[PDB]
Amino acid sequence: QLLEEAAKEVADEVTRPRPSGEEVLQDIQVMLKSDASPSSIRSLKSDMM
């Protein structure tokens, strides 16, 4: 959530002088990804919760 609103702040300042209507700073989802090997669905014990 910190990353999400951080993205929101940087988003508004970069697009800052916006036109009419599109001024209420819309929410900025931050999805993810990686390059490490995925782990198997059988390896989700309690400890990786």
Binding site: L2, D12, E13, R16, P17, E23, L25
Partner: protein, 571 residues
């Protein structure tokens, strides 16, 4: 209804443009902070626009908000230099706006409730003074229908609290973040805050735990004064109605107990909290205070109550006291410049009327008859107020500097007699009574009246009036008073001359030392009750006569007239 953005534009253009730039000079002075209060005049606004004036009369509070914010925004372009920051409050506001500029980010938008408010950051105040068209209405008649309406009232004061700091905008600081939140107060009470809505706190999920303090706050000069109907305003048989008035900013410390006032304000409500509804108290929020109608040689003395005839030397001595002998504090011991007169008389010579005229005349005056003001009425006592044992004053301490016109001194209570002896001798009133341990300060001058020894021995003049029936005297007086009934200087001009006369401060010359000592010893031989008190009497009367002449040096004419007056009184 209307649009208040349009109204604000109207008043902004008005304040910029109306007249020497009448309002412009005031605006620049307050911009530099050479004045802290401002006063709109509805006569000056009816000079051009009457609809706005009628609307102000009907919903004055809103337009007060409009005018004050309009001037607040007009401020900085009128500002031209760096003000010296005369107050720690100035330091705070400058620091606040400095850090707002520092972390401004001007494109960045901020919430509708994240901003330093006007009521905090104004540092000036704006009041009004209602139009001459607005008749001052009776304090009884200012009913619920006149709540919110702009209204002027004329009333006597009864008692006035002191200047204690009312809160305007409380300031709270946090335990973790460091921002500073505001609670703008409006009402008699506020529940403190304990949590900080600063966005750093909302991000951290920390305990607010903010602590109120007085440093960053905004207090104000606040008084609650009382007022009372005019006895002429009162209806046929009801007692005079009271009213509570609230005094703010540069309206504070104008009215004082006993002085007539005209207060211009709005009649706004407070929450009452046993019948249902939503009840509410009523206080009048003062917006202009003007004392009025009491506290704004030969022909002069004859002007003192023209409706009385004869007693010309009495009137001259009355004029003399009204000018007042020179106040002296040489070598610590006080020689007060008060003049004390008693009028012992046969039953009915208009001595009470003379006392009443002096009461109407003097800038401070208290006309007390025998028993209407006894004990605490003359002395000072204790009363519940911020509830507290407020010690307030009676007649003499109300007349602390003025003239107590005491009527029928002969039949006063013996405690009243003792107190009056104390105040004539030392201009204090010591008390060590049940719940009072004080020494009041009462620099009053006494005008006693009575009907036929301590009186003779403690005074500056006693006058025995015996209306020995003389046909021509009574004929002329009868013609005079009958003419008075037949036909039914101005007081303001008389009082103006007296007021200027009070402040010339003569100093006695050496040439009159031989004369005054010779006259003193000769008067003593002519007596042989006279003593050092009578010496001080002639000397004070000489100083006061020099004041009446307005010259700074006393002469032989003055002492001659003084001896003339005292000879007339004794005989």
């Amino acid at each position: 209804l209307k649009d208040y953005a349009l109204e604000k534009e109207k008043v902004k253009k008005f304040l910029q443009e109306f007249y020497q730039f009448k309002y412009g000079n005031q605006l620049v002075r307050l911009a530099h902070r050479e004045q802290v209060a401002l006063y709109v005049d509805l006569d000056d606004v009816a000079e051009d626009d009457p609809e706005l004036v009628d609307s102000i009369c009907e919903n004055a509070r809103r337009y007060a908000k409009l005018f004050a914010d309009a001037v607040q925004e007009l401020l900085p372009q009128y500002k031209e230099r760096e003000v010296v920051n005369k107050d720690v409050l100035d330091v705070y506001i400058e620091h606040r706006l400095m850090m707002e500029q520092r972390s401004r980010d001007p494109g960045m938008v901020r919430s509708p409730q994240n901003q330093y408010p006007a009521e905090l950051m104004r540092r000036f105040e704006l009041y009004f003074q209602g139009p001459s068209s607005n008749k001052p209405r009776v304090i009884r008649e200012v009913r619920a229908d006149s709540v919110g309406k702009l209204v002027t009232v004329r009333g006597i004061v009864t008692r006035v609290s002191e200047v204690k700091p009312k809160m305007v905008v409380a300031t709270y600081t946090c335990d973790q973040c460091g921002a500073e939140t505001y609670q703008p107060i409006q009402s008699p009470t506020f529940m403190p805050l304990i949590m900080c809505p600063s966005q750093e706190c909302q991000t951290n999920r920390s305990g607010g735990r903010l602590y109120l303090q007085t440093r960053g706050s905004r207090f104000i000069k606040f008084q609650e004064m009382k007022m009372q109907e005019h006895s002429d305003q009162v209806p046929v048989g009801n007692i005079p109605r009271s009213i509570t008035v609230l005094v703010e900013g540069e309206n504070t410390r104008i009215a004082q107990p006993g002085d007539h006032v005209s207060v211009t304000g709005i009649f706004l409500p407070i929450l009452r909290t046993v019948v249902q509804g939503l009840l509410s108290e009523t206080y009048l929020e003062a917006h202009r205070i003007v004392k009025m109608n009491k506290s704004e040689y030969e022909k002069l003395a004859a002007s003192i109550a023209p409706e009385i005839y004869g007693h010309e030397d009495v009137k001259k001595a009355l004029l003399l006291l009204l000018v007042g002998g020179v106040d002296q504090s040489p070598r610590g011991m006080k020689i007060r410049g008060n003049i004390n007169i008693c009028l012992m008389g046969d039953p009915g010579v208009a001595k009470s009327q003379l006392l009443s005229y002096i009461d109407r005349l003097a800038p401070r005056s208290q006309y007390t008859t025998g028993r209407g003001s006894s004990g605490v009425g003359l002395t000072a006592a204790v009363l519940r107020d911020s509830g507290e044992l407020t010690l307030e004053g009676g007649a003499l301490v109300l007349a602390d500097q003025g003239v107590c016109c005491i009527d029928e001194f002969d039949k006063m209570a013996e405690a009243d007699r003792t107190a009056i002896h104390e105040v004539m001798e030392q201009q204090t009133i010591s008390i060590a009574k049940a719940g009072i341990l004080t020494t009041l300060n009462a620099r009053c001058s006494i005008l006693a009246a009575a009907n036929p020894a301590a009186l003779l021995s403690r005074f500056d003049l006693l006058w025995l009036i015996q209306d020995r029936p003389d046909r021509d005297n009574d004929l002329r007086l009868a013609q005079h008073i009958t003419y008075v009934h037949q036909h039914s200087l101005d007081m303001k001009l008389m009082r103006r001359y007296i007021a200027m006369c009070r402040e010339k401060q003569p100093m006695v010359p050496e040439s009159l030392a031989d004369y005054i000592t010779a006259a003193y010893v000769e008067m003593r031989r002519e007596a042989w009750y006279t003593s050092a008190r009578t010496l001080l009497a002639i000397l004070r009367l000489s100083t006061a006569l020099a004041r009446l002449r307005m010259v700074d040096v006393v002469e032989k004419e003055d002492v001659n007239e003084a001896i003339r007056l005292m000879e007339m009184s004794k005989d």
